[PDB]
């Protein structure tokens, strides 16, 4: 699941009604696990679940994961200090 692609397939039969979708969700390092809005990233193994109209996959990884490897990487730390700075 290392690459985006890779991620993109998993996501053929994400529900319809998530108000979140796969292009957004990949490009952050998620995957499907199949079941419900449940993701995973490749890098932490960070799951996330229950998607909420206006959540963005970026600021969700960077709340809950802010150590992970691949978003520090990809984002740089101090977006992570600024999506902690107001939540
Ligand atoms: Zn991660
Ligand atoms: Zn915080």
Redesign the pocket.
């Known amino acids: 699941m290392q690459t985006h692609a890779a991620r993109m397939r998993t996501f053929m039969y994400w529900p319809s009604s998530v108000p979140v979708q796969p292009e957004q969700l990949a490009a952050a390092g998620f995957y499907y696990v199949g079941r419900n809005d449940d993701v995973k990233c490749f890098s932490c193994d960070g799951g996330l679940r229950c998607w909420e109209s206006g959540d963005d996959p970026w600021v969700e990884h960077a709340?809950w994961f802010?150590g992970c490897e691949f978003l520090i990487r990809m984002k740089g730390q101090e977006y992570i200090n600024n999506?902690?700075l107001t939540?």
């Open positions: 709340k802010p999506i902690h939540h």
